[PDB]
Amino acid sequence: KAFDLVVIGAGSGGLEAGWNAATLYGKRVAVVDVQTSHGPPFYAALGGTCVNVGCVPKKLMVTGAQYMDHLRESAGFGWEFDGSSVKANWKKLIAAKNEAVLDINKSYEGMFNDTEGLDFFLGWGSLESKNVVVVRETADPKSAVKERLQADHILLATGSWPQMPAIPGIEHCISSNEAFYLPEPPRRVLTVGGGFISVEFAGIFNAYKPPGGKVTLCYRNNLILRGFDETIREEVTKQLTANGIEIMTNENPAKVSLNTDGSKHVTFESGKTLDVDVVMMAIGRIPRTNDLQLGNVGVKLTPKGGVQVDEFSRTNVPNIYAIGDITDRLMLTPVAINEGAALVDTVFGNKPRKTDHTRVASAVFSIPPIGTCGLIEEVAAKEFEKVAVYMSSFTPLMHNISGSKYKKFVAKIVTNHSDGTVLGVHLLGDGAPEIIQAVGVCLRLNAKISDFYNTIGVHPTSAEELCSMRTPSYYYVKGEKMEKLP
Amino acid sequence: KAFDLVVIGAGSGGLEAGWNAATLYGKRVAVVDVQTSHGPPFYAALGGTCVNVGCVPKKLMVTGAQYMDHLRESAGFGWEFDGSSVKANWKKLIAAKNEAVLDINKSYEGMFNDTEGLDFFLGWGSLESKNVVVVRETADPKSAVKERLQADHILLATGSWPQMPAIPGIEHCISSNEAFYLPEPPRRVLTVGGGFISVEFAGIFNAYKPPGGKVTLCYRNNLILRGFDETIREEVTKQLTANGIEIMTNENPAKVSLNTDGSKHVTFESGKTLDVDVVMMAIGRIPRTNDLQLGNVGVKLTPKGGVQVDEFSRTNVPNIYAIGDITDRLMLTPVAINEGAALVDTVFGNKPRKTDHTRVASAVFSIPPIGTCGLIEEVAAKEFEKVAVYMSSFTPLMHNISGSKYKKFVAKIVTNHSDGTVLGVHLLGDGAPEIIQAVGVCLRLNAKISDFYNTIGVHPTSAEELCSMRTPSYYYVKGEKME
Numbered sequence: 001k002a003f004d005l006v007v008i009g010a011g012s013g014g015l016e017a018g019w020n021a022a023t024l025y026g027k028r029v030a031v032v033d034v035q036t037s038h039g040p041p042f043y044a045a046l047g048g049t050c051v052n053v054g055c056v057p058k059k060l061m062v063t064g065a066q067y068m069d070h071l072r073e074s075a076g077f078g079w080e081f082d083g084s085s086v087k088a089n090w091k092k093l094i095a096a097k098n099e100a101v102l103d104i105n106k107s108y109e110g111m112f113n114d115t116e117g118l119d120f121f122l123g124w125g126s127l128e129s130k131n132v133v134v135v136r137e138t139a140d141p142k143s144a145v146k147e148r149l150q151a152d153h154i155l156l157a158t159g160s161w162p163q164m165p166a167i168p169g170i171e172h173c174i175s176s177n178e179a180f181y182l183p184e185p186p187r188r189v190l191t192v193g194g195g196f197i198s199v200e201f202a203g204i205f206n207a208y209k210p211p212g213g214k215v216t217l218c219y220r221n222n223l224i225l226r227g228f229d230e231t232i233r234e235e236v237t238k239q240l241t242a243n244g245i246e247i248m249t250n251e252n253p254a255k256v257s258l259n260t261d262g263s264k265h266v267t268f269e270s271g272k273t274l275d276v277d278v279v280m281m282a283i284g285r286i287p288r289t290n291d292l293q294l295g296n297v298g299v300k301l302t303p304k305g306g307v308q309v310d311e312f313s314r315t316n317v318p319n320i321y322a323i324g325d326i327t328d329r330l331m332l333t334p335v336a337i338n339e340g341a342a343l344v345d346t347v348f349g350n351k352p353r354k355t356d357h358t359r360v361a362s363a364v365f366s367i368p369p370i371g372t373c374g375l376i377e378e379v380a381a382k383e384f385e386k387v388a389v390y391m392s393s394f395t396p397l398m399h400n401i402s403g404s405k406y407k408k409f410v411a412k413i414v415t416n417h418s419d420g421t422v423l424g425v426h427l428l429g430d431g432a433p434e435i436i437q438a439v440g441v442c443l444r445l446n447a448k449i450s451d452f453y454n455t456i457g458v459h460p461t462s463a464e465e466l467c468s469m470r471t472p473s474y475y476y477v478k479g480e481k482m483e484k485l486p
Numbered sequence: 487k488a489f490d491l492v493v494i495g496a497g498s499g500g501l502e503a504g505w506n507a508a509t510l511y512g513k514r515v516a517v518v519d520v521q522t523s524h525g526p527p528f529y530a531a532l533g534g535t536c537v538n539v540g541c542v543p544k545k546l547m548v549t550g551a552q553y554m555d556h557l558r559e560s561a562g563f564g565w566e567f568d569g570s571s572v573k574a575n576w577k578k579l580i581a582a583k584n585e586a587v588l589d590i591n592k593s594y595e596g597m598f599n600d601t602e603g604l605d606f607f608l609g610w611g612s613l614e615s616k617n618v619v620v621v622r623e624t625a626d627p628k629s630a631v632k633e634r635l636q637a638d639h640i641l642l643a644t645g646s647w648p649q650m651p652a653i654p655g656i657e658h659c660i661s662s663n664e665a666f667y668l669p670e671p672p673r674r675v676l677t678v679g680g681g682f683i684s685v686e687f688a689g690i691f692n693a694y695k696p697p698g699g700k701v702t703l704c705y706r707n708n709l710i711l712r713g714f715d716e717t718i719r720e721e722v723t724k725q726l727t728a729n730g731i732e733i734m735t736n737e738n739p740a741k742v743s744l745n746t747d748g749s750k751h752v753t754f755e756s757g758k759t760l761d762v763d764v765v766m767m768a769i770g771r772i773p774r775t776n777d778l779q780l781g782n783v784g785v786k787l788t789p790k791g792g793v794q795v796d797e798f799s800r801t802n803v804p805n806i807y808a809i810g811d812i813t814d815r816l817m818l819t820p821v822a823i824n825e826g827a828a829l830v831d832t833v834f835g836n837k838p839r840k841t842d843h844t845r846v847a848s849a850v851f852s853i854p855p856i857g858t859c860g861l862i863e864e865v866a867a868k869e870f871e872k873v874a875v876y877m878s879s880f881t882p883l884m885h886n887i888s889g890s891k892y893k894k895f896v897a898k899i900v901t902n903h904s905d906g907t908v909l910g911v912h913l914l915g916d917g918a919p920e921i922i923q924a925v926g927v928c929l930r931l932n933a934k935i936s937d938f939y940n941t942i943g944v945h946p947t948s949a950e951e952l953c954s955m956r957t958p959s960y961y962y963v964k965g966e967k968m969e
């Protein structure tokens with residue numbers, strides 16, 4: 001019942017911190033989660049949001065969606081078959097994803113069982129006192145107490161949860177959570193949001209829609225994928241349009257009414273309507289703080305609801321730490337994992353280490369995908385006196401033959417033009433996410449543009465474009481865009 | 487006429503060097519090649535071997551071959567279509583590849599038209615004297631003179647050429663050159679060699695073979711792809727086999743006869759026999775120096791037939807240089823290109839630079855592919871007292887759904903364990919050629935394993951394996967392997 005470390009949330013950050021504390025430093029660890037395997041009612045479970053209803057099933061389902069392109073594209077390479085016989089069996093895809101996620105759920109069960117002093121507790125974790133975690137049967141603080149856990153240290157790792165805009169008929173709409181378990185592929189679907197989740201799902205629904213199907217993505221502002229490279233944002237918009245996805249920008253649902261056939265009548269603020277079989281809200285995720293009862297030990301949130309932390313993942317309350325999506329910064333699995341490993345290496349390993357939230361490689365499994373690391377040029381141009389942008393757009397030779405001539409590969413390097421230091425790298429095209437990983441290592445090593453251009457290309461690849469760019473396309477000088485320096 | 491630079495060979499290295507001398511150093515430049523567009527009779531042409539009958543066409547063809555896997559694998563993700571309707575039309579592939587190669591040919595034509603001080607001459611370059619290149623009708627030095635080109639400086643950039651073993655029936659066999667122009671996909675093909683070309687073509691033929699077809703690869707030694715990571719060699723052997731390619735190791739063709747139907751009868755040294763429609767020899771590539779009449783100016787060759795060069799690509803004759811495969815160092819287009827740029831910067835720039843032939847990222851477009859940069863462990867182990875190998879190997883999740891459970895991804899980092907400096911990175915699996923590029927940049931920056939495992943992963947990717955390896959899988963200590 002006494003534990004060196006109690007962790008609330010057996011997710012990306014929580015398990016990393018948990019398993020490290022146990023196996024690296026022979027410490028004694030409890031991990032609390034509300035569910036041992038994926039799906040309704042709580043969706044997330046043992047393994048966390050990424051494993052159960054995030055990166056893992058998303059990537060398998062985007063891989064599924066990619067065959068719509070491959071099947072078409074194969075004809076340019078001389079592949080012949082009956083196109084009229086091609087059907088996308090959504091039910092098969094979901095069953096396969098379910099089995100893959102369950103095998104991972106069972107994998108972590110093994111991990112807890114085998115591993116000495118690493119114990120899983122089933123239920124809802126909340127804070128009683130600065131050193132006591134109560135495990136309840138339900139999210140209600142009023143529900144029965146399964147356990148009382150004494151803690152030299154408490155780790156909040158409860159992640160995030162979709163935000164549902166409080167509009168009339170929001171009970172007719174779904175989140176990403178429900179998208180993973182639709183029994184049928186929607187013929188018509190509105191994905192609401194211009195972020196990666198809305199974009200990724202629009203690709204998935206687009207590939208698996210029955211005949212006469214239509215995918216509509218709406219975004220409240222003018223250009224999807226805020227925080228990504230602007231060239232890439234414009235290109236992805238075109239490429240999703242080229243693949244039959246309708247992009248409604250400067251548009252936002254006012255309310256939803258169930259028609260009598262079970263379909264959804266969506267009324268926008270502009271006053272436009274659309275009938276769809278599914279409205280998927282992906283407008284934001286917010287930190288899961290409510291159910292922890294933080295007001296019972298005084299842990300400060302930020303003005304955005306996220307648990308306030310210093311660089312070492314420490315709350316105001318000694319011995320209470322917070323990592324991952326609950327901190328409401330970068331909502332990424334490998335950042336959660338990094339924070340967890342750093343916290344345990346600091347607190348239990350006596351090797352203080354802080355997560356670097358700069359120069360983090362990330363991706364959007366849009367079709368085709370984004371891979372990015374470091375600063376977009378607008379952000380750079382505000383911090384550096386002289387910023388150079390190197391840029392190479394090319395229709396990849398295979399996509400001339402494939403018939404997908406809209407699939408332009410985009411490679412941008414943003415540098416500090418004063419010393420040539422690479423500030424950011426932004427890729428759109430097949431392989432972008434794979435290419436960008438080792439770019440992350442390059443940025444950690446303080447790579448200059450000349451370290452890129454002096455490295456010998458691997459040919460033929462899209463990646464070699466990164467080692468072929470010696471001349472800036474344009475510059476920002478004291479925040480001002482211009483073709484040439486004075 | 488009189489030129490600052492004459493380049494013999496309008497290929498990867500030759501075009502880089504000539505474009506740079508003309509456009510960057512404002513030199514007057516002549517370039518010579520035997521053909522303006524791809525294919526028979528001389529196969530290479532304006533653009534070089536890579537453009538015409540190497541990297542470019544082979545990658546388009548491997549891309550085509552990849553759909554055999556995609557169509558099958560789609561079914562795990564719920565794609566359904568009439569499998570019995572499925573045909574691999576090799577004719578369309580070849581037609582698509584030809585148009586793509588010809589457009590490159592044409593654009594190089596336009597480059598020569600449009601670039602002032604850069605002249606193309608059609609036909610066969612050879613050295614008359616130390617400042618005179620002669621262009622002739624044919625490879626034969628008795629052939630009619632087309633041009634005589636006075637040159638301050640001469641660059642030899644004629645590349646390499648398939649090696650054919652002098653065996654009975656060699657005339658019934660082809661190289662990669664002819665393979666790019668087969669009118670029909672062979673039902674039965676023997677690829678001869680364990681190198682990237684035999685392996686890459688084995689995959690290409692395997693996807694486009696007509697029903698009840700079979701691809702056989704034979705290799706003299708025990709394990710294909712010498713010079714590659716040993717784990718990767720054994721896995722690529724397994725994964726080729728699992729896709730229905732017959733790997734015959736410790737086997738070499740003794741001779742070839744025609745059966746009555748004109749198929750080829752393969753007599754292996756082991757006595758063994760194989761009946762095939764095509765025998766593709768991919769056993770080596772040798773420098774193309776025979777036709778250059780290098781005796782006329784006494785340019786030093788190796789017994790092999792390569793042009794001997796220092797680190798700056800200088801022959802023993804001042805004002806004459808060799809870059810690319812003709813030097814027989816690293817036979818890769820970007821190395822040829824790098825050598826070409828570095829030479830022009832040395833001669834005309836007085837900015838002396840040598841190509842670094844170490845830590846060069848390269849790929850094999852096997853299915854699945856290889857990406858590699860720097861030393862394999864057995865090499866590293868002979869040079870360094872303590873060598874760490876970090877290894878990650880698994881069936882990627884999507885290949886449990888796809889059915890291709892045989893497709894193990896392999897990521898291995900080799901380090902000097904005394905300081906953690908990365909000596910080599912070896913990848914097998916989808917994306918490997920794309921992952922390894924930026925790894926090349928890392929090794930140029932002397933990355934250590936700590937720089938890899940302190941870098942935050944992109945998830946979910948294969949590449950993040952490179953940033954998840956904290957602890958050696960095993961070591962070499964004074965050349966000895968230690969679990």
Ligand SMILES: Cc1cc2nc3c(=O)[nH]c(=O)nc-3n(C[C@H](O)[C@H](O)[C@H](O)COP(=O)(O)OP(=O)(O)OC[C@H]3O[C@@H](n4cnc5c(N)ncnc54)[C@H](O)[C@@H]3O)c2cc1C
Nearest residue numbers: 009011012013033048049050054125159324325331332333
């Ligand atoms: C659709 C989608 C796609 C994504 N794709 C990617 C991607 O491709 N790459 C990427 O890097 N990131 C991706 N993410 C983000 C990623 O899932 C999160 O950043 C990551 O899971 C955060 O980890 P964490 O440790 O913060 O918590 P989580 O991994 O979310 O784990 C939190 C856990 O806490 C549990 N929990 C909550 N409250 C309690 C309680 N009171 N008591 C007990 N247990 C509790 C939940 O059951 C859950 O299992 C995606 C997210 C979503 C929603």
Ligand SMILES: Cc1cc2nc3c(=O)[nH]c(=O)nc-3n(C[C@H](O)[C@H](O)[C@H](O)COP(=O)(O)OP(=O)(O)OC[C@H]3O[C@@H](n4cnc5c(N)ncnc54)[C@H](O)[C@@H]3O)c2cc1C
Nearest residue numbers: 495497498499534535540541611644645810811817818819
């Ligand atoms: C099947 C195959 C696949 C390959 N795949 C890859 C790959 O994926 N990646 C990679 O990096 N490398 C690859 N290579 C290697 C790559 O093509 C070579 O390393 C590169 O083309 C060599 O460049 P170079 O400048 O040395 O010569 P080349 O590009 O070969 O240029 C030589 C040129 O000289 C011409 N020529 C020859 N003799 C004469 C003469 N006497 N007068 C005038 N012109 C002459 C030829 O017609 C030719 O155009 C491949 C090679 C082959 C054969």
Ligand SMILES: O=C(NCCc1ccc(F)cc1)c1ccco1
Nearest residue numbers: 394395396397460461462542545
């Ligand atoms: O396709 C291209 N790049 C991807 C790699 C590749 C594939 C196939 C190739 F033949 C040659 C390169 C491309 C088009 C213009 C410049 O690069």
Ligand SMILES: O=C(NCCc1ccc(F)cc1)c1ccco1
Nearest residue numbers: 056059060880882883946947948
């Ligand atoms: O597949 C794997 N890795 C590639 C990236 C990925 C793709 C899709 C996924 F669902 C999950 C990860 C893998 C299997 C075991 C460990 O890594």
Ligand SMILES: [Br-]
Nearest residue numbers: 707708709712
């Ligand atoms: Br061997």
Ligand SMILES: [Mg+2]
Nearest residue numbers: 112113115118
């Ligand atoms: Mg245990």
Ligand SMILES: [Mg+2]
Nearest residue numbers: 598599601604
């Ligand atoms: Mg000209």
